[PDB]
Design a protein around this ligand. Structure first.
Ligand SMILES: Cc1cccc([N+](=O)[O-])c1
Ligand SMILES: Cc1cccc([N+](=O)[O-])c1
Ligand SMILES: Cc1cccc([N+](=O)[O-])c1
Ligand code: FES
Ligand code: FES
Ligand code: FES
Ligand SMILES: [Fe+3]
Ligand SMILES: [Fe+3]
Ligand SMILES: [Fe+3]
Lengths: 192, 446, 446, 446, 192, 192
């Protein structure tokens, strides 16, 4: 991709494309699909401790941004482009998990219902770090609670996964640029 | 409903009809008597520092463009083209010398003036009076230590007088700290609550913290955490409550400079605030230096709220009686180290942002309380705000305003709703003033 | 609209203005004159049998908590906290001694009383009059053979008198069978219809069955199946229709004890009902024993419907003029074998539940008839309910109420809508009674 | 709001209150005074050519069945059953001798008559007066060269008189070309705009084209493409504008027979139109033959718009003040080769259909202009339509109607809104006529 | 998963997790994906007879429940927790299919449009019955009709499939615990 | 499928089923998934020029129809059944791409956000043209813009793909019969 010609494409997005267009390894795509399907299963059943133990690396950065709407031609205004809905290390994820499991989390009674749909999985090993796996995937996340509250979230996830304790591949970075600027879901209190 | 006569808020602010959180006709009336009349938060200097910088903001349900002029002032205009009424600006922030309408190409300056019209000579000749076709301007725009507010009503009091007795409490952090910056962009989330539900909660509500936020207090690693699950009442003299003539109010929780921030930030913050307090003792006195590093939960009437020290800054933007668009910024002290500012901003969003785990605790409370105000058997029911009534004072030698000298009470609810009712039943500022000539006497009865 | 004067339902119930299914101002008026005034279905003993058992239920648009007291009675209260109006209970059923509000922690008993307030001594001292802060109670709660109804209006007739002539028809199944159980939890589905559309259909509408349910009759393996596609009219004397002073009514289809149940259940049911009928002949007489094992399509005014024998029990919960939340339970006879009860419950949901193939046949009929009531050219149009008019009787020696001695007609529509119009045009029960002093004469004209 | 007195449109149509695009009470009033009163587009002969052919169409918010009768006439009826008000027809087009209701099986003829009632003899006997139970008929149905319009008001002028001076401009293409066909089915898309926003744009708005459609002009390969980005003003005498007594109006862009069609179709079209123009010179004169092959952007008051030559045919079906359902058909000349008709139809949808890239350019303009009419500070603001005012003529020797002899102006806006205001403030056609007795004098002032 | 630690996880959900975490057989996941994609295709084109013939076993139980909202701490109230939206044997499915195909099913004219999205496929052979295949998958089901009616359903499906006549794998059990308590789709008259 | 028995099934749909029920080639399904995932990635990042270059054949027909609602029993009314929302050759797609990239496309500022979810991939070689690959897939397409505008599109895609320049498989036909008759998405200005 030439971004001077493809005028709507960001440098960041062009760089990510290049990653997956080269070595395609079908076996790696299959492993990545398994990994993400198992992760989503654990989250959907609200096994948040199991998710941390089995899916999340100690060095993780778990980040979801919301980017301010700016002019496509803008070139002078320079201030912080985005805020962090999430930008969590492992200890901060653990705080959120404890908050979910606390018996005085009144919003969790009656129990929530989560269903996740993971699609468009791509996987590529890092060029320079042969032990770093880049995985991209898209998620639809359906949250239902309290008879008639239904919230559906849509996002693309840029992940890095690496083998950790016991040789288990674990999430070391997730980056989501959330596509809806104003949330119409009451909150973003879900793990994308 | 006859808003001149209907008692929506009882004497001394002791109760409110539950319908106030649900009634759409009242919502439409608030557009006129609350939002078109009072001061509303727009932006901060830190977000539009240079000439030509602009942001969009809501004022009630209206959208405005807020622009830094070449002379260093700020002017705000309706985001609506003067020709056929198209929305002029579709972005949230930027830098420009003007704004061109995408319908027929009319060009307006950063100063609101109609500067150009395509093919004006050939089409309008000399017949178009561009001088009369400037964007509709917000009559009043003023600053409180970099925080920019607007008001559509030319008759409003100056912003400083409008803050009334609340200003004295805000000044140690807003002024004497060296000044604050607003860290953008804000989080934005729609909730199914009336704008008054979060407004009242922030103005006045320490009672809910231990129970509502039990899980966040226990999990979250913070300085107020002894409150989790109502395990412990704040000690005697742990704080106070205040309110003011024009409806603004706050709670003061003495010394809680690390606020909701998780143990990760507590030592750093407690050191930083303590060190600045030591310097301020000499300049503004021990009480006001202490206020600087005390946690203030405040609502600037009607719909701007904040938690100082925690650094949470909120706009409760009204959409309808059961819909509000919540904007969340972080406030930081300008002289903090940049790395600390960054971590503070993230922590504000972590706790009170779109995925704020503390903010999440409040969702059902605000949503259902609001929605119940539509329900037939609850419309004429009375929401209670009597805690601490008959123990408030006015004109205290140390702490100004109507003050409850206790950490937990409903003093600030009473003042908020007294102001609300005075506006709803008045046609203009003169009538509000007449309706408010005994405001503090009303609030300190019994 | 002036509800004192507006003729929404013509004399003798012969027609109704189509706007009644669409007009939101009328819907709001119904909240007052229908739902706040009349008896509404809450639950069954079988769902809250033990002390402390509770369920939530709607009464109109209001939500209530319905709780079994220690003394064995049932009391119902608005599901709204007396402090700042938060919804108290977020679940549909449970067992508890009380309910604690998640906002500020106020604790109410199962008896509605405000039992505790966190830190009451330190905060309120002796100033909070808890005796006056009990949950808002439903004035009237009464039982019809285990079926529990509520009414917000203290002036209402007793439930039994309110059932009027309909009670005589219900008693063989509700009482003389040994009693019924409601099998929960209900299915819950929102439909885009006015609550009156399904209410009228169940009260009175056998005419639609052959055509509307042609596919379900043909496919579904059932006892009324000769009706598919209007292939055959029920024989002479196959049934009757009735209606009553307070608007309740039903159709009677003689002998159809297996109802909508598919051939799988037909022999078992026909054996069971026949055997009980043989015993009941001695106790209540042949006619009433036959009624026990006859299919009754009934609406208990305003918005509770049922099909006895089929075992379908419905609440048409109003949301707005074109939105209704449909609750579907199964009713079973207590002395049926447990395995039969299980299969009957599943069959009720299979036919009339959220994926009920019979219920599905009705969707478009109710939705479009309702939505058309909003359309400009249809608002002032007349919905017709004249079938059988001038052939109804009152005071028959065998069958009480206003009775049409034919299986298919609009007798029950006429009585439903006569009651509806009398309520809509009246300010209280006394006025309804005055408006209803010649109810049966009006219905049997010509 | 008092519609007799409220000035919604200023004298000479020079401005309109922005609230007209947002106010739901006014929308409800338009149902009565615009949509129930005026001529509305239904279908074309080409879509229901044979006896028994029918389509459904909207007339305002009402839905009608439009049916070709055996005698070759067309009749239209409300799509609502005369029994309990169910929607009769659920499809958009077909062929049938009648329509059977899926609720209780009543059968209506293609002529609207109630022909059968299931089991009528056994159930109603001789008591049902079927002669009085025909579907509610659209009072007036007339054709303009195969284009079929309906009107609920028996007092309306004939369709031809209603077209007023606009008819003279349409006739070369609609009549003298040999006739047009409408190519179905239409695209259907909902937009969040008031119906008047697209109506006004099509009637009168050449000013927006260069700027709004800059990208479509540049990309799209078309004959008007020199306009992209306001790079070039149309030359002197490139066109004109007109309007009429009953609100219909159009722009005329001389010679633009290929319209919005991409370079792929330009040579073929320019050849075809030129060749027909040469034949028509002899029959209707050079000016009118030229009009035939000139691009007309027209609104047939209230809510039917078209671009002749481009072949775009639009219905702006109202839903509420900020919701409109857009129907898009293609119009073609009957004597064009079939392969050209096919490609023209696809090109119409390519440019102005549901994925029409030109139509897409207009979305934000119409949506935001409409939605801004709800915003508090904009409700009482003035939308301007003064371009060209004081240069219009009436009674010209060559071009009839109120005419602006320039390609770009707001002549047609002024006439549209003069008619709109006369209807909104009138109770019937007689009052409209009284309010319009000096229509052209009002429009040509100054 | 330890459900005493992962406080939000049900015993049932923990048992189902364990099933897929053990033997992973990539070939089985692929077969299961094919099976489900073909099933969804047949349903989407309304080939309901073909679906019964090719996809559904004679011994099938086809079950969709709706569970009453109860307190997370509830431990005394004991009455029926759920109702059956569907709980069908083969003959009962056949009744529903005949109802769909009946020419006097007025609601089916004009013809409905269905689109199904099947994701998160996992497959594992039963431990004790070597011929029983457990398949889990999530579905989004889009139903459109009558110009402007659109209903979207979201669910997780716990299936058992077994080889039947001709060696064709057929559905012998489907269990769905429907995540939305109050349906906002007019009805649940779709085969999930 | 016998469409005289399966009364709701169209001849067209029955023909398409038969295509995928025969030779199943697992490797071909995997290739097709890659192809579609890469296509969706390019579209999601608005690399429209790259999409044309890498994914779209010179001989393409790109077609999305909207079919008029007719009676299931209808057999006399014969007029055009459908209109073309899209029916584009390569040059017409290029026009649409230029329209997207034009800096005076005001509707594209602030930049749109697209997320696509591709599922239910099936692939089969043509019987008669050994170089023609039939691919079927379903798409959910999420478009977000301007703070609070969110539009979600749902469709089944019948594609033919063929190896073109450099041996790269490119789209030669896409056919979508759009399932919603009246669009509730403001427009259909998205590439399905
Ligand atoms: C975390 C916290 C602390 C004090 C006050 C509030 N409040 O009023 O929302 C919140
Ligand atoms: C299946 C059935 C049988 C008799 C009556 C009704 N109804 O009024 O709904 C339904
Ligand atoms: C493409 C085109 C050309 C002339 C006029 C219009 N219009 O009024 O929408 C559109
Ligand atoms: S609406 Fe802005 S230039 Fe016309
Ligand atoms: S709202 Fe219930 S305790 Fe305050
Ligand atoms: S509603 Fe049409 S036949 Fe009864
Ligand atoms: Fe809080
Ligand atoms: Fe029915
Ligand atoms: Fe345009």
């Amino acid at each position: 991709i030439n971004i001077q010609e493809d005028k709507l494409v960001s440098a960041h997005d062009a760089e990510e494309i290049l990653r997956f267009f080269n070595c395609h390894d079908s076996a790696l795509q299959q492993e990545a699909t398994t990994l993400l399907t198992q992760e989503a299963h654990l989250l959907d059943i609200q096994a948040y401790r199991a998710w941390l133990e089995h899916c999340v690396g100690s060095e993780v950065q778990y980040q979801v941004i919301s980017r301010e709407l700016r002019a496509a031609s803008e070139r002078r205004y320079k201030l912080n482009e985005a805020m962090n809905v999430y930008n969590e290390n492992f200890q901060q994820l653990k705080v959120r998990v404890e908050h979910q499991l606390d018996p005085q989390n009144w919003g969790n009674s009656p129990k929530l219902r989560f269903t996740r749909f993971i699609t468009n999985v791509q996987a590529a090993m890092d060029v320079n770090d042969k032990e770093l796996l880049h995985i991209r995937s898209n998620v639809i996340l359906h949250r239902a609670r309290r008879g008639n509250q239904v919230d559906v979230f849509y996002a693309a996830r840029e992940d890095k996964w690496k083998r950790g304790e016991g040789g288990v591949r674990k999430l070391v970075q997730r980056f989501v640029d959330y596509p809806e600027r104003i949330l119409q879901t009451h909150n973003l209190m879900v793990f994308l | 409903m006859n808003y001149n006569n209907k008692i929506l808020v009882s004497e001394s602010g002791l109760s409110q009809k539950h319908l106030i959180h649900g009634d759409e006709e009242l919502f439409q009336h608030e557009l006129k008597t609350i939002f078109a009349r009072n001061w509303l938060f727009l932006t901060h200097d830190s977000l539009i520092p240079a000439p030509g910088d602009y942001v969009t903001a809501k004022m009630g349900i209206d959208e405005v463009i807020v622009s830094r002029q070449n002379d260093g002032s700020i002017r705000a205009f309706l985001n609506v083209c003067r020709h056929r009424g198209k929305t002029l600006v579709s972005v949230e922030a930027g830098n420009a010398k003007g704004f061109v309408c995408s319908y027929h190409g009319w060009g307006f300056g950063s100063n609101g003036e109609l500067q150009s019209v395509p093919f004006e000579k050939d089409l309008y000749g000399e017949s178009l009076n561009k001088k009369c076709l400037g964007l509709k301007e917000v009559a009043r725009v003023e600053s409180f230590h970099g925080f920019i507010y607007g008001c559509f009503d030319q008759e409003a009091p100056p912003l400083m007088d409008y803050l009334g007795d609340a200003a004295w409490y805000l000044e140690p952090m807003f002024k004497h700290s060296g000044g604050l910056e607003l860290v953008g962009p804000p989080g934005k989330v729609v909730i199914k609550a009336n704008w008054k539900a979060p407004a009242e909660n922030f103005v006045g509500d320490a009672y809910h913290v231990g129970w509502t936020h039990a899980s966040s207090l226990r999990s979250g690693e913070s300085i107020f955490s002894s409150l989790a699950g109502n395990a412990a009442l704040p000690p005697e003299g742990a704080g106070l409550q205040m309110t003011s003539k024009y409806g603004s109010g706050m709670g003061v929780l003495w010394d809680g400079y690390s606020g909701v921030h998780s143990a990760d930030l507590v030592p750093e913050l407690m050191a930083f605030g303590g060190a600045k307090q030591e310097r301020l003792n000499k300049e503004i006195g021990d009480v006001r230096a202490r206020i600087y590093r005390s946690h203030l939960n405040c609502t600037v009437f009607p719909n701007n709220s904040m938690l100082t020290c925690s650094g949470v800054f909120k706009v409760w933007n009204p959409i309808d009686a059961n819909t509000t668009e919540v904007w969340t910024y972080a406030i930081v002290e300008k002289d903090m180290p940049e790395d600390l500012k960054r971590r503070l901003a993230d922590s504000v969003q972590r706790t009170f942002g779109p995925a704020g785990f503390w903010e999440s605790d409040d969702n059902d409370n605000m949503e259902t309380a609001s929605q119940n105000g539509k329900k037939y058997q609850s419309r004429d029911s009375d929401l209670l705000s009597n805690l601490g009534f008959g123990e408030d004072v006015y004109g205290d030698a140390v702490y100004p305003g109507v003050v409850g000298k206790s950490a937990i009470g409903e003093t600030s609810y009473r003042g908020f709703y007294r102001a609300y009712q005075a506006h709803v039943s008045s046609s203009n500022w003169a009538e509000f003033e007449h309706a408010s000539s005994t405001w503090h006497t009303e609030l300190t009865k019994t």
